[PDB]
Amino acid sequence: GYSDRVQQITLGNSTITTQEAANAVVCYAEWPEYLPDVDASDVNKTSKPDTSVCRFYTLDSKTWTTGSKGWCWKLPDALKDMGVFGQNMFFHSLGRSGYTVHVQCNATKFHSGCLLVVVIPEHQLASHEGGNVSVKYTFTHPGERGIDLSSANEVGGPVKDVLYNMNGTLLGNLLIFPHQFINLRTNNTATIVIPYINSVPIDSMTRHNNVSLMVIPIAPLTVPTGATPSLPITVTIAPMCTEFSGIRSKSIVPQ
Amino acid sequence: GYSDRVQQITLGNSTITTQEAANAVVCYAEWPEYLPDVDASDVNKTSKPDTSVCRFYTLDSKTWTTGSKGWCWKLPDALKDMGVFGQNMFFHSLGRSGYTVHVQCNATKFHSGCLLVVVIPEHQLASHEGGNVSVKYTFTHPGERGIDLSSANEVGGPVKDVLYNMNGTLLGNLLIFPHQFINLRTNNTATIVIPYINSVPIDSMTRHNNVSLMVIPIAPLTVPTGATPSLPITVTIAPMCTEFSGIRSKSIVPQ
Amino acid sequence: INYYKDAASTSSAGQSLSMDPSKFTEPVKDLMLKGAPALN
Amino acid sequence: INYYKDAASTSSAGQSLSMDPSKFTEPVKDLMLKGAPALN
Amino acid sequence: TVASISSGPKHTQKVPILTANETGATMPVLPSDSIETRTTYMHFNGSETDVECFLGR
Amino acid sequence: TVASISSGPKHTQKVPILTANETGATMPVLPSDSIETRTTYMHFNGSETDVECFLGRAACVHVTEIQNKDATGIDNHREAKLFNDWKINLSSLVQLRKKLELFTYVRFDSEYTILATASQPDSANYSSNLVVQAMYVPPGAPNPKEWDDYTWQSASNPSVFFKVGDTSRFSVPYVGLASAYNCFYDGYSHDDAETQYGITVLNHMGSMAFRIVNEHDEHKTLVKIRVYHRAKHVEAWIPRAPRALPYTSIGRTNYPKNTEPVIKKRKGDIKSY
Amino acid sequence: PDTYTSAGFLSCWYQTSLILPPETTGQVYLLSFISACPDFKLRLMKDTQTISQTVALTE
Amino acid sequence: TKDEVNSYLIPLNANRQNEQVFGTNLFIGDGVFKTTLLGEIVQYYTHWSGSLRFSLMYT
């Protein structure tokens, strides 16, 4: 009586149940694991807070309306302030982590709409100015708020044009990245497990984000007659196999 | 060529060397160890940050002068703000820890003076008011500053009379507690290893301090002629075998 | 002979005959031998 | 040692040490396994 | 006797915490079905809750 | 067992009497390390210094008093000593208290003994024979209000009935929340800015209620209750410095202001005998 | 209830939100139950504050 | 304000986001818990220890 459909994920002191899942994706078919010695470089023993950092943090909720263009969060940024995960983050020189991402959106059998939930490794954004204008730090570190693709261009911020993925590629091809759809008629959640993907064994958690999670409405939300025209979307994310190394004074970052 | 005299303690990412030690005391002849299952009650898996919390924090320095009466720090309070030790502390419901305490005071072969360095398990202080006046919270949670026994009585604070240990017992008998002397002529540091001592397996780190460390001048400081009449005393302390459990929202404590 | 069912109801305990002052008199980390120099 | 002849005169009984809540907590006709779906 | 066993992360298709109370059962769910636990023992028998004890004073 | 071995002259490079007290140890030096001794045996075991023995005799822990009199028109029985409770604790009387506070944590079963004697301070024809009821009202139980409440039915709460002039005796297992009783506690019940400090916030074992079962005779009768406590099955951890100043309160360490010097001043010099 | 000995809080919030189908309206309710795990221990019997009386009952 | 079948019902509102459904402390011997069978038995004893199971059935 197991269905692909019902699932339970327990991680730390927190549990999620979905009764309307559509399997789960594990990026590149690899599950998060700690850093092996053969791959290690820094000689420091690392710190593995385990259950105090590897639990589920639910970010603040978004509201899908007929005019929504899509939202974008960066990792580990989105979690920069969650509990002890965040403290560890500002206090060590280097850290490394994988995540379980669970995006939630329920409706009824009269609604229609379909969101794309995708994880993009190394999502370098484009400046809407063109040329070689850079995208300032603050703009690519929105924190739990994430970036709202239907917000206005700002100065020093990225471009927010959806048919171009914020980088000069077409929305249609985002499907080459680990992703899952939430089609109100099928699905009510999306779950993706992200292994740590980098060109170095461990890195800085503040100067470099290693994935952007993106939720994009593709088939517009259509509510039943005289229904309220909107649904909330909630994102809950859990660091998994986290390791921190090179402890010290506590980083100070712009803004 | 090993002497009782020279020592090195490396704990985490921090190391201490003393070239003029007088052995080291291990309270009640027991070395800190984690909490065994047979002794466990709370069903929660605990978090053991290891090297990020088990390193040496050096508190701010004191100044021994001919008029000094002695100083008193409480644990884990004194460390409530040190790095990730402190964060963990405010963020979990329960925690447990042992410590290595290293008290430092060097002079020259012309100085004289002798400090008592003692650890008192469950040091319940007395109100200087008498009767059944209580000692308010803030007063018994001085933080890294500790309590200065030569400061004035304050209201809601403890009594600071040294011949009575702040509790109705005589200074002379403090020697029944694990302790070590720093006699300028012999010694320049004192080191005590404290195992976790409580009547419960794990407790709250904020509502209850489980040891007071006390440094008390007993033979007054006497400097050579026309020397400056004072010496600094420094206290460095390292949590060891720390475990935190029952993570959540982050305690808010008076003042 | 206990006449009662519960353990609290039994008489006083019997002498530890345990006795080991070293946790109190010699809690030093490196062992000290009497007769050898205290500080080497 | 009973000093008396009748059974009513003996002391309290001794712990059931029986304990089986299932007649109260799971009186369902078809067995339910924890983890399997409640309603199939 | 163990009061709690050790249990770690879970990502299953087997959800012990979803039930149907309409059935009249109280499903025997434990801390270890929904958080990560460590082993602990009971140290207790339930002696003083025996009905002989409850009605016996 | 030898108390001293035989030992003779010494001229060594091995000096057991020179040590460094800064280390925190008390080196086990004996008479035979510094004088010439002869063999002698101990003839003694140290039996009567066992902590079970030290804390194991009955000590008076509480004296209270109740009276038997007509309650007609009494608006507050508790206040007329028609009945009286005892927010149970051992810190009350100082003799046993100093003994227990030689340790930080203590664990033991208690064997209480209650003596009740009657007094008839004003003109009575006779001495009546009263039965006392002592009922242990643990925390969370209804608290008497009148001397003949439904409370005193004490259907679930252990109670003993004995006669004035007699004694009642019954022991109770170690009913501490923790693994042991704290003799000291440098904490609070929560991080409140004004919540009490010390043990008091742990001592919450309820209170003992006493009453006379008898209705009133024509005269009044004063009954004075003395509770004795004996520790059995004792276990004590972490020795501390003995109490030097006088006590002021149950459960706090506080000593009185302008107390007197506790160390006896010499009548003479340091050099005096 | 005692402070030192206190056990925490229990709260519940919308994670996303309740959504009713068409032709439907108003409030929906949750029923909530409580029972003890097999884990549970109770000790030191005493009298309940939940029942009292002022005169003996009769038939 | 008077005991009613309605105090067993926790109401839910359609379309609210982020908000709080109910809250309670966990003094099992008092307050909401007190009249429940669990609450009612706990009150015959002085001390309790163990895990509690709290479930919600949606209607």
Ligand SMILES: COc1ccc(N2CCN(c3cccc(C)c3)CC2)nn1
């Ligand atoms: C400070 O140490 C102690 C040591 C023992 C103790 N208790 C007081 C309550 N007492 C008790 C327990 C149950 C029933 C009755 C009448 C009395 C047991 C001993 N209280 N404090």
